[PDB]
Swiss-Prot record:
Any single Gene Ontology cellular-component annotation: calcium channel complex
EC number: 5.2.1.8
Biological classification of the source: Eukaryota, Metazoa, Chordata, Craniata, Vertebrata
Domain of life according to the entry: Eukaryota
Tissues where this protein is expressed: Detected in heart muscle (at protein level). Isoform 1 and isoform 2 are ubiquitous with highest levels in brain and thymus.
Protein's recorded name: Peptidyl-prolyl cis-trans isomerase FKBP1B
Similarity remark: Belongs to the FKBP-type PPIase family. FKBP1 subfamily.
Amino acid sequence: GVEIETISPGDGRTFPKKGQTCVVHYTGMLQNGKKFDSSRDRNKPFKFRIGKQEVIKGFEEGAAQMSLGQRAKLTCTPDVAYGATGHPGVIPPNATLIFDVELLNLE
């Protein structure tokens, strides 16, 4: 499940398509716990493309429901991120994920 809660401003028309590369300042958060990832540290704003399953599913579908300039707030259920597996050492199994996401894309 993906549940968008948008911090408003953007344009409401510019949506990503297939094979397009988008620029995201993602900022993870575990529920009732501290951070686990950011791109604000590295200042390397994570140019990835759409439809190649490179990111996880819950992060991928939430970028499709955003526009240029928007600043969403994802909430990924465990079944679409790691919840049976668990990333070893960083994300425990059966974990709910939160993502502060800004989309200032190109293309």
